[PDB]
Each structure stands twice: as structure tokens, then as C-alpha cells.
Paper text:
The endonuclease [name] from [name] (strain) has been reported to be a dimer like most endonucleases that catalyze double strand breaks. [name] makes a double strand break approximately in the middle between the two sites (the precise pattern is 5′-CN11–13↓N9–10G-3′, where the arrow denotes the cleavage site and C the modified base). Here, we report the crystal structure of [name] at 2.35 Å resolution. The structure reveals an N-terminal PD-(D/E)XK domain in agreement with an earlier prediction and a previously unrecognized C-terminal SRA domain.
Crystals belonged to space group P4(1)2(1)2, contained one molecule of [name] in the asymmetric unit and diffracted up to 2.35 Å resolution. The crystal structure reveals that [name] is a two-domain protein. We therefore conclude that the N-terminal part of the enzyme (residues 1–140) harbors the nuclease activity and henceforth refer to it as the catalytic domain. Therefore, the C-terminal domain of [name] (residues 141–293) will be referred to as its SRA domain in the following. The canonical ‘(D/E)XK’ motif in [name] is changed to ‘EID’, with Glu68 in the role of the acidic residue of the motif and an aspartate in the place of the expected lysine residue. Metal ions are not present in the active site because crystals were grown in the absence of divalent metal ions. The pocket is formed mainly by Pro207, Trp205, Trp215, Asn217 and Glu228. Interestingly, we see an isolated large peak of electron density close to the expected location of the glucosylhydroxymethyl group in the pocket for the flipped base. In agreement with the biochemical data for the [name] variant used in this work, we do not find the predicted dimer in the crystal. Thus, it appears that the tag, despite not being located in the dimerization interface, together with crystallization forces could be responsible for the unusual monomeric state of the protein in the crystal.
Residue numbers in the entry: -6 to 290
The structure:
Amino acid sequence: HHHHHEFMSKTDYILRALSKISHKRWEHYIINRVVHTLDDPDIEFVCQQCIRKEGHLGKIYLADLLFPQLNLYLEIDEAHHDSNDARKADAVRRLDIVEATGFQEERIPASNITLSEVNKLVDEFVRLVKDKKEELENQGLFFRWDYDERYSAKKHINTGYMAVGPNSVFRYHRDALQCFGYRREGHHQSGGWALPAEVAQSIGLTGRVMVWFPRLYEAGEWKNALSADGNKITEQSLNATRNYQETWDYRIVMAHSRDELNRTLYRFLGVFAIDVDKSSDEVKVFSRVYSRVNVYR
């Protein structure tokens, strides 16, 4: 009764996440204090996630702690942001970026503070976390961490739609495709998959829609890129036979990304469409149209 596709048990995740190396003076301490004193194994947490903030275009920050269920992250604020730029640059190349649209941001100054003050600010953050949980258990909106299902279709099918954010990430193509009527047992490995017309219409788009699983760097005979703000994709064909005319009205983009241990994940970037006047037969520019999309049934 193992999980045939899992690299890491939930317990191993928790152990490594808390014992991670850091260069910030207060980080390891704050993170452990929070999580240990929070003591709630139903609350999902993510450490050291790079994020985008709505309206800060092409800017990348670092959330030292992020809480996917509660729309909340913590920033341990180090006067010096230049040094974190190594990590950030790495995360950008791996596309380990979470669009934290909708998230409440909290801060804890990393500098000029006593142990005692840190303890204080952390106890407050923790109560704020417990509060957010209950504001939501109270409205029936809280679902307990489901680690086994973290990269599968299940939560998206249950919600009815999906949005860019921490949770709309998929292990395999087929996980993503199961959100859009894919019923095959088998795996899908190619770069694209056509929605049936009943599905496209059902989920509220029009015309011809595909799911695209692009690698947004230079690979094979494509030199592809994602824009600094994450709203434009450019696609450069490196082979003449490969040049084509775009015939899709919408592409649902599940981009290839990699985690810290370099395992492949697919990250929902939103729904895109071709920008005709900005494109040619060799280079195409797709602009983002929606950051959210309904899930089939």
C-alpha cells in the first residue's frame, strides 16, 4: 500500500523542512519555533518559497514560511536582499515560483532584536495562524493537509476550478489532464493535449483549447522563455520544418518546473493566447488571458 509515484514521505518532508540550512541569523530559529509551538499537523507549511506579489511586476520575493490553506506567508526581513539573490536566481531557473495572489503578508524584522522580542513576535504570528484556521473551519472552508494528494487532480476536481497559486501544481501530465476530461489509464508524454469540444465549452472557454506543457528555456529545437512578470511566453523554433501557424484559441499552460531535489513538476501559469501582431512564423508570443480556469466536472 505504498505510493508508487512518491519520492518523499510526509514525515521526511517535515524533518528536512525544519532542519534546512540557512544564512539568515534568525530564520532556522523562527521557523522551528513557529512550527513546533503551532503543533498542528493538519496545517500545511512550505519553507523558503520564492513568490510573486500582485502588482510588483517582474519582482521576486522570498517567503520564509508560506501557508497554502490560509492565504498567508511570513517574511523574516533581512536588511540585505542582495545575498538572497542566489537562491532567487536558482528558483527562477527551476521555475520554483508561487504567484501569491491573494495572500496576506506578515513580517518579522530579522535585525536589531532580542531573543525575547523574537519569541514575542512569533507567538503573535502563531496565534494569527491559528485564528485564520478557525475563521475558516468556522465557515466550513478548511481542508486538512492531504500530503499524499498534493500533486494530483483531486483537490481541483473537488473545488471546480483552479488558479495560479501554491496548489495548482501537478506531478505528471496526466494529473493535469484529468482536470480536463482525460479519462485514459495511461500516461501522456507529448507537449500538448487537445480538449474535446464538450469540455472546452463546459469549463467556459470558446473555440479550440489545448493544454500545453512547455519547457520555458532553450531545449531541443525550441528556444522558449517566460517574461519577468510571468505574463508573456515567447517561442522560438530552431528548426524550419517545425515552423507552424497557431491554430489554438487558448492554451492552458502547465509549465515544466523543478523542485529543490530537481524532480519535475508542472506548474499552472494560467490561460494564454497568441498575440498575432507580435508574432511570426518563427517566433510566437503568447500573452496571458486568465490566471484561473474551471475544472471539468
